[PDB]
Amino acid sequence: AVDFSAHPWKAPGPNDSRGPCPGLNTLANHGFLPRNGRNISVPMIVKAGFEGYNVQSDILILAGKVGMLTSREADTISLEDLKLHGTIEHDASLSREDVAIGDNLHFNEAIFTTLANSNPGADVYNISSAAQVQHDRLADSVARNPNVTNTDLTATIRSSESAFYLTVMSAGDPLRGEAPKKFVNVFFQEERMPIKEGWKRSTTPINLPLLGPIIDRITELSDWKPTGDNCGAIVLGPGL
Amino acid sequence: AVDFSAHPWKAPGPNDSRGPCPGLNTLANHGFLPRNGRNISVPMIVKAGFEGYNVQSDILILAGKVGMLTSREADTISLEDLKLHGTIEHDASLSREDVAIGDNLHFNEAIFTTLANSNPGADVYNISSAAQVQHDRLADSVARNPNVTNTDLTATIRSSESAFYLTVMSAGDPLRGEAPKKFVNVFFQEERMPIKEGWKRSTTPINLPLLGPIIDRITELSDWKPTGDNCGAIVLGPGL
Numbered sequence A, B: 001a002v003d004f005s006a007h008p009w010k011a012p013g014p015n016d017s018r019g020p021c022p023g024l025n026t027l028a029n030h031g032f033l034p035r036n037g038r039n040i041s042v043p044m045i046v047k048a049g050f051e052g053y054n055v056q057s058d059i060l061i062l063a064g065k066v067g068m069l070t071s072r073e074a075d076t077i078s079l080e081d082l083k084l085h086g087t088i089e090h091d092a093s094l095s096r097e098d099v100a101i102g103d104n105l106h107f108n109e110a111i112f113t114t115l116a117n118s119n120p121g122a123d124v125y126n127i128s129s130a131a132q133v134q135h136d137r138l139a140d141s142v143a144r145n146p147n148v149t150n151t152d153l154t155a156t157i158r159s160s161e162s163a164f165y166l167t168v169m170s171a172g173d174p175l176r177g178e179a180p181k182k183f184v185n186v187f188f189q190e191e192r193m194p195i196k197e198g199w200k201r202s203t204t205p206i207n208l209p210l211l212g213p214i215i216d217r218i219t220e221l222s223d224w225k226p227t228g229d230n231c232g233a234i235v236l237g238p239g240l
């Protein structure tokens, strides 16, 4: 049971911390996480992701504790902290620029155009369109960023993020790996749950067993290859 | 106010969780951390390390949050969880065996002999002896472990651990980078604060600024070289 009327969307104020993740930013914009985007713990993320999206603790504990590395605090982050390049934040994002050549934090409409224009002739994004977008975004980074980092780990994270927008913003069973364009576009562009537009929280739990085959299929269709060393080493904290 | 007399050493029972770290095990054995070694958060580690050893939050937050990755819980570990190979736990330990050829968890006297016999003719261990021990322990792993991992990261972690025993178990200013053998031996062999033997908590804070030059000097004197892969990629969670 969750009451979305008790969780209205509100635009972030000037002192509200927001990060590179539309998932967490949207939860904050609805007060499932603190609207100020600060002093956020893994337990808070677990609860917020469950209440807002029906995303389960398996993925949120795993990703959450990696995310905690990005702050200087014992057990919390600000959402903006997650911009730390090379922990989770990576090149060839769907809606942000690469840090070496631009802003790796804020939503960018020109970057988002690739996703927005994907799956022409359908009213949904799906696994094949998501894979094509990942292929095109990586090619863009390889072309324009001489410092691009593209590893097994970044590629897996990227497919996980695509799987997230396909599942959390779904109309039908998230298993199907497709989501209305109208829902996904609001998610990214406004960091809002598209309630007025007809979206409802999944009644099916979204967990690693559900996401895994979607992730693997997106990767397979994306015609991916590693770059350089292919070293999957994360940055372990800020300012090292 | 911290009262060391209210923190007696007690040997762990068979179901009290202990890990590969003598620093955290000793805090547990004195009740600065829970004696059962479970349900331990980074704030708890920060407070325990301050109270017991005068180790500051900078290093304990950084290491603590990496250590949290080893459990399946949102914000706690058991001490035994820290044995997870390739997060922090590494080959060429001072007092444990390499996981591929033995027990990477428990104190082992035969391994410890190298450290115990270091700095002949003196009643202290110091930076040069610590470096010699690291050189010899790595050589042992290269000789006997077909799955040996030796990277910049493991080498740095090893120097950090040597810097910890030299500073936390010091008699004089921890700056000096030397510790009585009688104190360090009790620390490793019994995971006890050597209070009866004359040890007292440092009155000087032990933080990254203090440890950094000690760590770097231990590395430099150890005649360390890359041997293979050199990708400092940590394991991000259990059972992946």
Ligand code: HEM
Binding pocket: A020, A021, A022, A023, A024, A045, A049, A053, A055, A060, A063, A064, A066, A067, A068, A082, A083, A088, A089, A090, A091, A092, A093, A094, A095, A096, A161, A162, A164, A165, A168
């Ligand atoms: C709650 C469900 C979640 C959803 C639905 C979600 C969704 C997404 C999506 C779609 C992106 C890609 C943005 C892009 O490429 O432009 C993303 C990026 C990101 N997410 Fe999440 N996320 C969730 C949870 C988390 C958690 C728990 C963390 C914890 C650290 C996190 C950290 C990030 C980071 C750092 C990025 C930036 C990666 C990059 O594009 O460079 N997310 N998220």
Ligand code: HEM
Binding pocket: B020, B021, B022, B023, B024, B045, B049, B053, B055, B059, B060, B061, B063, B064, B066, B067, B082, B083, B088, B089, B090, B091, B092, B093, B094, B095, B096, B161, B162, B164, B165, B168
């Ligand atoms: C800050 C939180 C801490 C975490 C998460 C942590 C974790 C660990 C881990 C996982 C190991 C095993 C590495 C290996 O040898 O394979 C280790 C070793 C060690 N730790 Fe800690 N530690 C912490 C704090 C401390 C403190 C405060 C001290 C102070 C005494 C300390 C001293 C040591 C020493 C001397 C070793 C080396 C043991 C050996 O090589 O046999 N640690 N630590």
Ligand SMILES: C[C@]12C=CC(=O)C=C1CC[C@@H]1[C@@H]2C(=O)C[C@@]2(C)[C@H]1CC[C@]2(O)/C(O)=C\O
Binding pocket: A021, A059, A062, A063, A066, A088, A156, A157, A158, A160, A161, B236, B237, B240
């Ligand atoms: C992408 C992800 C999930 C969504 C997100 O926004 C941030 C992250 C960062 C950590 C990722 C995580 C996963 O989805 C699971 C990953 C990708 C993990 C690191 C390795 C991992 O645990 C794995 O090897 C199997 O999935």
Ligand SMILES: C[C@]12C=CC(=O)C=C1CC[C@@H]1[C@@H]2C(=O)C[C@@]2(C)[C@H]1CC[C@]2(O)/C(O)=C\O
Binding pocket: A236, A240, B059, B062, B063, B066, B067, B088, B156, B157, B158, B160, B208, B211, B212, B215, B216
């Ligand atoms: C080993 C350590 C501590 C324990 C742990 O589980 C994880 C790490 C990784 C990063 C280490 C950190 C330190 O303790 C301080 C170090 C070693 C740092 C990298 C360089 C460093 O910041 C330094 O002081 C000298 O270069």
Ligand SMILES: *[C@@H]1O[C@H](CO)[C@@H](O)[C@H](O)[C@H]1NC(C)=O
Binding pocket: A038, A039, A073, A074, A075, A076, A078
């Ligand atoms: C909350 O975060 C701020 C930084 O935004 C930090 O100064 C403060 O100590 C944090 N509080 C905790 C311990 O949760």
Ligand SMILES: *[C@@H]1O[C@H](CO)[C@@H](O)[C@H](O)[C@H]1NC(C)=O
Binding pocket: A100, A146, A147
């Ligand atoms: C990119 O790599 C070059 C070396 O190839 C380096 O000199 C430069 O500083 C890097 N730039 C960034 C932004 O990391």
Ligand SMILES: *[C@@H]1O[C@H](CO)[C@@H](O)[C@H](O)[C@H]1NC(C)=O
Binding pocket: A119, A121, A122, A126, A127, A128, A129
């Ligand atoms: C995605 O939709 C397009 C257009 O409707 C279709 O051609 C394609 O086969 C779909 N892919 C998947 C994986 O369903």
Ligand SMILES: *[C@@H]1O[C@H](CO)[C@@H](O)[C@H](O)[C@H]1NC(C)=O
Binding pocket: B039
């Ligand atoms: C673990 O610690 C938390 C926080 O103090 C507490 O609420 C919980 O009940 C504890 N669990 C156990 C098994 O003791």
Ligand SMILES: *[C@@H]1O[C@H](CO)[C@@H](O)[C@H](O)[C@H]1NC(C)=O
Binding pocket: B119, B120, B121, B122, B126, B127, B128, B129
């Ligand atoms: C360590 O002690 C030995 C023996 O007393 C001495 O020869 C050596 O120079 C010392 N090294 C340092 C760094 O103090």
Ligand SMILES: *[C@@H]1O[C@H](CO)[C@@H](O)[C@H](O)[C@H]1NC(C)=O
Binding pocket: B146, B147
């Ligand atoms: C360890 O090394 C042996 C011998 O080279 C090899 O057969 C085995 O697969 C290795 N195991 C690991 C942990 O990779």
Ligand SMILES: [Mg+2]
Binding pocket: A020, A089, A090, A091, A092, A093, A096, A097, A098, A104
């Ligand atoms: Mg990015």
Ligand SMILES: [Mg+2]
Binding pocket: B020, B089, B090, B091, B092, B093, B096, B097, B098, B104
């Ligand atoms: Mg070890």
